[PDB]
Nucleic acid binder design. Structure first.
Lengths: 152, 152
DNA sequence: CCCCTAGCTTTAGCTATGGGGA
DNA sequence: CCCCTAGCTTTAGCTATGGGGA
């Protein structure tokens, strides 16, 4: 959910808007291709532990709203999503192979999305331990334990 | 400024709120230590091409609003920021070395910030080339040349 | 900005805060 | 969640989508 926890002690929420277009901004992302593209991206996300919040395509581009573990790195998810989908789709639909040198370009757009944390930041500080005493360890455990994670 | 470009062809704006607290949430980020802390983080940001939009400490924690090249990785800026400041600060002020086992903890808070792209995404797509014709190469070069970068 | 090579997956087709440069 | 180990910088003191587990 909105606020995750690293496998260790990193408290985060890293949502990214990602957008990239086919070679020549070709309008191939429709029908069969559009469907498989979304499926392939889905498999990559689960595998790379990326939370696809939203995802839609519109002929000459794909728009993804994703949550990504800051330790992992947005470009790793993109590298894979673009690389694989390109190999698969070009294998599945030949006009994507015979008419284009590649499926994608070396470009892509990325923007961080989120609003002023304010209170979330206050709760984070307040719950850090201020000693090794029992109460403190309990305060912290209760805090992080009540956070979302990304297994698989 | 707000919308940058990679050394290659990545059009981005990745802003992050970053917060970490001293070990034990000790209120040591004041006076001399606070000043030197900000100075150190300023040097690490410039060395790592990280843009510090805003920074402020407040006794028991430092708050940073940074813009980082998506291909660089948030944790590399934090690793160096926490890592170096700790080494230096504990070297310059002994009460930080004798009274604490480390300066920081293995925790930190990270949240992406920024609103929906909407029009910025439309302009991104509209300026992708749709062919190798000269006009398209001009439209594109023109677009990317009119974007911010991070030299040094 | 381009193209070239490394690096790694998808072993094709993508990124590298990559690199060098009429 | 903890602690251990390795990696890399600050060669101390931090992170690793790290690892393993009363």
């Amino acid at each position: 959910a909105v606020l995750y926890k690293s496998n260790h002690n990193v408290v985060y929420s890293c949502k990214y808007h990602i957008v990239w277009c086919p070679k020549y901004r070709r309008k191939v992302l429709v029908g069969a291709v559009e469907m498989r593209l979304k499926e392939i991206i889905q498999e990559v996300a689960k595998e790379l532990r990326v939370e696809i919040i939203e995802m839609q395509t519109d002929k000459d581009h794909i728009h993804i709203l994703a949550d990504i573990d800051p330790s992992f790195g947005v470009m790793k998810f993109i590298k894979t999503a673009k690389g694989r989908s390109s190999r698969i789709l070009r294998q599945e639909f030949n006009h994507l192979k015979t008419k284009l040198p590649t499926l994608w370009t070396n470009s892509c757009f990325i923007s961080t999305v989120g609003g002023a944390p304010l209170n979330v930041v206050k709760q984070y500080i307040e719950n850090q331990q201020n000693s090794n005493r029992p109460k403190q360890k309990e305060k912290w455990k209760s805090y992080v334990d009540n956070l979302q994670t990304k297994a698989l």
